[PDB]
Automatic annotation (TrEMBL):
Pfam families, sorted: Pect-lyase_RHGA_epim
Matching Gene3D superfamilies: Single-stranded right-handed beta-helix, Pectin lyase-like
Top-level taxonomic group: Eukaryota
Organism: Phanerodontia chrysosporium (White-rot fungus)
The protein's name: Glucan 1,3-beta-glucosidase
UniProt lineage: Eukaryota, Fungi, Dikarya, Basidiomycota, Agaricomycotina
Top-level enzyme category: hydrolase
Record EC number: 3.2.1.58
Keyword Nucleotide-binding among UniProt keywords: no
Cystine bridges: C5-C424, C73-C77, C539-C549, C692-C698
Key word Metal-binding present: yes
Length: 752
């Protein structure tokens, strides 16, 4: 416990009529590498910019000034980490008449005690009320969709009910490090209405969750490579979810009430050169009441894989058809019953490479009990917002001497904040980049909250030696136990840093509090950013930067005694430079992404690990992990060089079987109770050349398990890899058995 208090802060001291803490907290954020750090406002209350919030004044332009202010990344800008914005909305109804354009690196945040309403005016015109990627003449857009990172919308009512024609709440054409949190969509239930909650046509996501859709023709149109979605509720919709295409997604905790169709799944072809539909859906813990068809496919499957589905723990009350083909036959009859485990697609057992095409119940999926809440469902825990906490329950790191200016060594000031306040106050990292040169231990008991772009950047000799790797952030002491919640933080390095273990996670849940230790909207954005030493000017794809371009030793280390509930975390070794303009590719060296030795419980919900040399995920003597969806990519420069280079073999942190030519997406040794429910593991290059994408042979193997591990894979999608699944570095499941569009999919694998 911190030295300023006698027992832990365990609840807020706000009076219920007080505005949400974020409005009145001192606003001290800096954009460190902005052209004008001293004049550039990070926080913007929409009312300070003229918003009335009275339902009659058109507030579109006032809100837009709150977004736009400071000269930010708009038309003609690829990406930015240096022009952040927290757009804050106090209670009110804000009438808008054209799209609010949510620029690169913007968070829209409503009062969380009293959700503000965004009210579409009856003459609303435009693609959606909130627009994350505007279209320009010629079908250009502000941003490349696969590059459209850093965006959040939290705590709104979105009310389309005054629009008599079509209306869309959010054009959410986004990729990783984005979330939608705590939003209610109010839509017409009139016959023939054309209301749509979300329109999403492409992207490379992503996490979103905790939304309620009331009414509408379509709750969400979703088209995107991959996404994890937690705790959405669809009431009185025509189609809850109109899924138009994907490689593979995971849906957890879905509720569909009084809808015509729940999931409307567009089926496509099986070749990488044909029409792309929905490759894979993995749905776990769904409740469905008074709905005609729970899941409908656009077309039938004739005895081979052509669109994959996994269902786990589906509770149906008055749902005639569980799975059916559009104007085709019923595939699984419903009624009032609980579906335990059911799949459509190719099911595999052991080291036998034989597909069993399945449209039927499958062996019951093991769900280790430690991973399940007290209603028996995968734990579901939303981003903590501290709604009943008052501003004085927070302590500001800027107020305690941490400069956040990206230059001053902030190690001591930060260390001191933890020593004085851990467990005493919520620790508020005002926006900024905080340079540290020694381990920052976050003690068990701590709650940490950032402000859109609050970065801890480790640098210097403690972190440069791969033979002696050292932690930049330590989450709890070894053996420790307690609440640790981290929200809106970035953990990174200033290169070179070949010895950086960016996050070492030790803390375990206390007895009887599940997911009390976890991170939300918290990422490891490794290189590719302003003044990181790891940009295109230091690290060209030629490899000319050499030993300067070591970015880290390991991104995230989950240790033996730890538990972690990790939601949306992107462990991104930068493939390209976000800040120099041009999205230029760069070659950076990370030895590995995520290594877990944790005995559990570990929930990894829509985490991604990308561009590390030896593996994106390594589970070594781990137990009791629920992983879904997990997304990877191999570093673009491989096989030049081959793993482990430019590192050397390390027997503590590397797998026994090193990747041959290319990194493992996931490699598992001596582990049990591991459930991977939804995976997208990709390989797009051979030494910067894309030629291997067409013949689908960019790398040879990508997923390894040993002989003994107790691990199960469901909806395992890989891209451009010959062997999709290996036991003891020998290919077992060949891609040629599972083509499913652009990507290839294993519906189920189990040892037996
Ligand atoms: C799934 O997401 C929804 C949408 O965010 C979550 O529902 C929300 O839950 C919060 C926290 O329990 C509710 O607030 C509570 O209100 C009661 C009185 O109404 C008060 O006694 C509490 O102190 C608390 O503030 C909130 O109303 C509710 N929001 C909506 C629109 O329903 C839900 O928690 C999520 N479920 C899971 C499993 O994550
Ligand atoms: O698909 C992607 O798009 C990006 C390429 O623009 C890359 O930065 C991400 O790491 C990758 O997931
Ligand atoms: Zn928060």
């Amino acid at each position: 416990l911190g030295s300023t208090c006698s027992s832990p802060l365990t609840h807020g001291s706000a009076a219920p009529g007080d505005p949400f803490w974020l409005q009145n907290i001192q606003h001290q954020g800096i954009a460190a590498f902005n052209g004008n750090p001293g004049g550039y406002p990070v926080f913007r209350n929409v009312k300070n910019y003229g918003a009335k919030g009275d339902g009659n004044t058109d507030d579109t332009a006032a809100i837009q000034a709150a977004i736009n202010a400071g000269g930010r990344c708009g038309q003609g800008c690829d990406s930015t980490t240096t022009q952040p914005a927290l757009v804050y909305f106090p209670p009110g109804t804000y009438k808008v008449s054209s799209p609010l354009v949510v620029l690169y690196q913007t968070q829209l945040i409503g009062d969380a005690k009293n959700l503000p309403t965004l009210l579409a005016a009856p003459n609303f015109s435009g693609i959606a009320l909130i627009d994350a990627d505007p279209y320009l003449a010629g079908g250009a857009q502000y941003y490349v969709n696969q590059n459209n990172f850093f965006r959040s919308v939290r705590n709104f009512v979105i009310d389309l009910r005054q629009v008599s024609g079509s209306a869309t709440g959010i054009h959410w054409q986004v990729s990783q490090a984005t979330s939608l949190i705590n939003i209610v969509f109010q839509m017409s239930t009139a016959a023939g209405n054309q209301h749509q909650g979300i329109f999403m046509e492409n992207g490379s996501g992503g996490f979103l969750g905790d939304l309620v859709f009331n009414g509408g023709n379509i709750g969400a149109t979703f088209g995107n490579q991959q996404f994890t979605v937690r705790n959405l509720t669809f009431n009185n919709a025509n189609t809850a979810i109109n899924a138009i295409w994907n490689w593979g997604w995971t849906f957890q905790r879905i509720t569909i009430n009084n809808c015509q169709v729940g999931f409307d799944l567009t089926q496509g072809g099986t070749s990488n050169t044909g029409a792309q539909g929905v490759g894979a859906e993995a749905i776990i813990d769904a409740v469905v009441t008074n709905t005609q068809t729970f899941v409908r496919w656009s077309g039938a499957s004739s005895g081979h894989l052509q669109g994959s589905l996994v269902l786990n723990n589906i509770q149906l009350t008055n749902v005639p058809v569980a799975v059916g083909v559009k104007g085709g036959p019923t595939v699984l009859a419903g009624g009032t019953t609980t579906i335990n485990s059911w799949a459509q697609g190719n099911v595999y057992h052991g080291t036998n490479g034989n597909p069993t095409f399945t449209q039927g119940n499958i062996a019951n999926i093991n769900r280790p009990g430690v991973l399940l809440d007290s209603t028996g469902r995968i734990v579901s825990k939303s981003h903590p917002q501290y709604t009943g906490y008052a501003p004085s329950d927070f302590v500001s790191v800027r107020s305690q001497g941490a400069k956040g200016d990206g230059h001053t060594d902030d190690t001591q000031a930060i260390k001191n904040v933890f020593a004085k306040y851990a467990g005493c106050k919520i620790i508020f990292f005002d926006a900024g980049t905080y340079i540290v040169t020694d381990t920052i231990q976050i003690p068990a008991g701590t709650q940490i909250v950032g402000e859109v772009w609050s970065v801890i950047m480790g640098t210097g000799s403690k972190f440069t030696d791969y033979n002696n790797p050292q932690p930049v952030i330590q989450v709890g002491a070894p053996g420790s136990s307690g609440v640790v919640e981290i929200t809106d933080m970035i953990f990174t390095t200033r290169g070179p840093a070949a010895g950086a273990i960016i996050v070492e996670w030790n803390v375990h849940d206390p007895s009887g509090q599940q997911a009390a230790a976890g991170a939300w909207d918290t990422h490891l954005i490794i290189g590719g950013t302003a003044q990181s030493g790891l940009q295109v000017g230091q690290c060209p794809t030629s490899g000319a930067g050499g030993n300067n371009c070591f970015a880290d030793f390991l991104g995230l280390h989950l240790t033996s005694g730890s538990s972690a509930y990790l939601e949306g975390m992107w462990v991104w070794l930068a493939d390209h430079d976000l800040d120099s303009g041009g999205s230029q590719q760069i070659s950076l060296w990370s030895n590995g992404g995520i290594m877990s030795e944790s005995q559990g419980p570990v929930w990894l919900i829509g985490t991604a690990s990308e561009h590390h040399i030896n593996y994106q995920y390594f589970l070594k003597n781990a137990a009791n992990h629920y992983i879904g969806l997990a997304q990877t990519e191999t570093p673009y420069f491989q096989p030049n060089p081959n793993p482990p280079a430019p590192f050397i073999t390390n027997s503590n942190f590397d797998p026994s079987q090193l990747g041959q030519g290319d990194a493992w997406a996931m490699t598992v040794q001596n582990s049990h109770g591991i459930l991977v429910f939804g995976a997208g593991f990709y390989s797009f290059f051979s030494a910067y050349n894309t030629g291997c994408q067409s013949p689908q042979n960019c790398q040879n193997q990508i997923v390894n398990v040993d002989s003994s591990s107790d691990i199960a894979f469901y909806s395992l999608t890989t891209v451009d890899t010959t062997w999709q699944f290996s036991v003891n570095a020998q290919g077992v499941i060949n891609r040629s058995n599972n083509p499913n569009g652009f990507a290839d999919t294993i519906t189920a694998w189990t040892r037996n």
